[PDB]
């Protein structure tokens, strides 16, 4: 009876919309009992199975739907979504393209196709496909919100104010109607949403995990209530998809090995396979235990492994980012579960207990922005492995080509030995800065740069062109190894002015908004002799930024773009800037640590969101409060002072140069010890029978 089955199918659709997925599944199945050859019920059932993470069962039903109805466009598009989740991009594309072939006006299929282009880095095509979707279906929250993010990525600010208004209105409607918001939690920081809206977005995404673990029918775990089974050692589990060549590893790769084996037993749970890098090698060798959970795709069996390991504190380093398996945390295999470092915001999730942060980043008065209890590190929660990865940058020398500290820079593990081989090296006392006069050796180096040569030899020492690192040692370029040569870095390599101030920002362009570019333009106009240095991150954002800047009155030559560089070159070339202008919308995080390691002062204006306050936290730890602006006028005033008062610039640069070493900011040994003290606070609290509470002293 297709008629009765149709009624059941429609009722299932309604239940599905209401978030009652179990009842929907039951009804679709009943529809198939009444009408076994019901293509629509097969396809609709598959979609809810997909929601429950039953991907192979979903595929089976999609294929059944298409067997019954070979031109069933909805089934193809829906099947494409499942293949995409399965990491079969070619298959997904084949499905979406088939769906559009059948129905040229299939809005959802155009939007789903767009998502592939977006993920591939083809933003213009994503934008085109999302626009087609919105033309065919103007009320389409998923397409609108994903289009908004595409535009954000390339700094396309067309109708920006109205766009933000609509995003907020969409989210409000979805929240009121109990639907999953079309704005991703990780992106919510970029839009003028209330803190309440941002937390509610995160909460609802957190709840999706339950759809995927509910079908596992697992009981609650019994947790350890003491450290007896572990010989008085606290078992800490670090869970991350980013053990390998990823910013997360560039920040914390040293921490597992630095933990005190007398008090802690460290387990690292990798959600990704071995990428073959030294980052992966290091963590695997230095953790007490290393577990490749990428080999255990079932979250149930994977959670079982974590529980059976006896983990006391399980640490979520992904939050809502690519590669996350928050389902593992939803199963609570550990008695205490903490967010740390990898995700700049609240999980909003029932299954997370704490967020490790700090007083500057997350002041107590903003506790309402987070579902987790706040757990303060004593300085900043941020950390970086720069002192271990890039020790060649601890010292520098310059060439006096006329004394600037940032026009022609030398760095090298054997730099002092090289300098000692020269008869005429002078010192500028700040540690202090050796200067090579404009001699035969200096011309030799400059010639190498101008001739585009890869490297030369002087007094037995290899002197490398900083633009050619991948040709000399690719491991040194990625940061897997410390470069063994003396490296030359020059403003001329990047087309930077020799006789003007360079303001830089090396972040992905999506962190810039109209208000920020306007601030920057205000600074440039007040400091005639200056340029802004940005990255093609991505390159298609460049012409957009240029257009807005030109319209603000800045000629094209005041904004210099460089390509994204290998890790080592990126950190090293920060030495060429005078000042970094931080993005207030979302700060540099890793990027902030990168620029400070070069000794480059960073001007920041902290906001209310965690992501907007990290840079100020870094600077507070560094001991440079003069770089923290309370408002737009001050941000501008500070940057302008640094660009016009060269004696003040010199003093602030010296402060950063010294304090990156003397302060706790890059001190991983110290950080780890403080992290441990915090872990023990959490444990003692739990062992006394307490639920989580703020650890903010």
């Amino acid at each position: 009876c297709p008629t009765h089955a149709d009624s059941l199918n429609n009722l299932a659709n309604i239940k599905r919309e209401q978030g009652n997925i179990e009842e929907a599944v039951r009804l679709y199945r009943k529809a198939l009992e009444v009408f076994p050859e019901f293509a629509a019920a097969h396809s609709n059932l598959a979609s809810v199975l997909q929601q429950q993470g039953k991907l192979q069962e979903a595929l089976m039903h999609y294929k059944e739907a298409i067997r019954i109805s070979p031109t069933f466009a909805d089934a193809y598009s829906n099947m494409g979504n499942t293949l995409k989740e399965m990491q079969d991009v070619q298959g997904a594309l084949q499905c979406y393209t088939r769906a559009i072939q059948i129905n040229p006006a299939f809005a959802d299929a155009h939007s789903n196709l767009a998502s592939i282009h977006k993920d591939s880095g083809n933003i213009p095509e994503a934008i085109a496909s999302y626009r087609t979707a919105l033309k065919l279906k103007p009320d389409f929250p998923d397409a609108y919100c994903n289009l908004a993010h595409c535009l954000q990525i390339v700094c396309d600010w067309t109708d920006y104010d109205e766009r933000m208004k609509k995003l907020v209105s969409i989210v409000a409607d979805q929240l009121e109607k109990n639907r999953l918001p079309s704005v991703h939690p990780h992106h919510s920081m970029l839009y003028p949403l209330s803190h309440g809206f941002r937390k509610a977005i995160a909460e609802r995404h957190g709840n999706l995990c339950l759809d995927k673990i509910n079908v596992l029918h697992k009981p609650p775990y019994e947790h350890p209530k003491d450290l007896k089974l572990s010989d008085g050692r606290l078992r800490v589990g670090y869970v991350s998809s980013d053990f390998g060549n990823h910013p997360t590893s560039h920040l914390m790769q040293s921490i597992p090995g630095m933990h005190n084996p007398d008090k802690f037993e460290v387990f690292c749970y990798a959600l990704s396979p071995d990428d073959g890098t030294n980052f992966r090698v290091k963590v695997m060798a230095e953790a007490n235990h290393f577990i490749d959970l990428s080999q255990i795709p079932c979250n149930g069996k994977a959670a079982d492994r974590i529980h059976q390991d006896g983990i006391h504190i399980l640490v979520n380093m992904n939050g809502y980012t690519k590669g996350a398996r928050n389902e593992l945390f939803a199963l609570r295999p550990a008695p205490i579960q903490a967010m740390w470092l990898g995700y700049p915001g609240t999980s909003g999730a029932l299954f997370m207990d704490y967020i490790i942060t700090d007083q500057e980043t997350s002041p107590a008065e903003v506790a309402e922005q987070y579902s987790e209890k706040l757990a303060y590190m004593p300085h900043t929660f941020f950390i970086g492995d720069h002192a271990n990865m890039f020790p060649h940058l601890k010292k520098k020398a310059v060439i006096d080509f006329k004394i600037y500290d940032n026009r022609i820079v030398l760095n090298g593990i054997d730099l002092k030995a090289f300098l000692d081989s020269l008869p005429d090296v002078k010192i500028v006392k700040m540690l202090n800065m050796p200067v090579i006069p404009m001699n035969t050796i200096a011309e030799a180096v400059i010639e190498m740069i101008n001739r585009g040569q890869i490297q030369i030899t002087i007094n037995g020492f290899s002197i490398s062109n900083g633009l050619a690192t991948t040709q000399i040692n690719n491991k040194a370029a990625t940061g897997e190894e410390v470069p063994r040569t003396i490296i030359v870095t020059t403003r001329s390599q990047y087309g930077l002015p020799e006789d003007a101030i360079v303001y830089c920002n090396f972040n992905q362009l999506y962190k810039i908004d109209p208000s920020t570019l306007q601030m920057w333009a205000n600074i440039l106009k007040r400091v005639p002799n200056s340029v802004l240095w940005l990255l093609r991150f991505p390159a298609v954002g460049e012409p957009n930024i240029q257009q807005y800047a030109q319209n603000m009155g800045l000629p094209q030559n005041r904004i210099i773009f460089s390509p994204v560089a290998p890790k080592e070159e990126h950190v090293r070339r920060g030495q060429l800037a005078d000042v970094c202008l931080d993005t207030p919308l979302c700060n540099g995080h890793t990027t902030g640590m990168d620029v400070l390691w070069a000794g480059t002062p960073m001007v920041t204006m902290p906001g209310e969101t965690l992501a907007s306050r990290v840079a100020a936290s870094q600077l507070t730890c560094l001991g440079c409060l003069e770089l923290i602006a309370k408002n737009r006028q001050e941000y501008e005033d500070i940057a302008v002072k640094l660009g016009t008062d060269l004696e003040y610039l010199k003093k602030v640069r010296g402060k950063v140069w010294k304090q990156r070493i003397s302060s706790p900011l890059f001190n991983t040994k110290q950080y780890t010890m403080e992290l441990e003290r915090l872990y023990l606070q959490m444990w003692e609290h739990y062992a006394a029978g307490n639920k989580p509470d703020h650890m903010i002293k």
Binding site: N9, S47, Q50, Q51, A75, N78, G80, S111, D119, D142
Partner: peptide
């Protein structure tokens, strides 16, 4: 990892 849209067939 950009999310997608399932179509409910009536």
């Amino acid at each position: 990892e950009t999310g997608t849209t399932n179509t409910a067939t009536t």
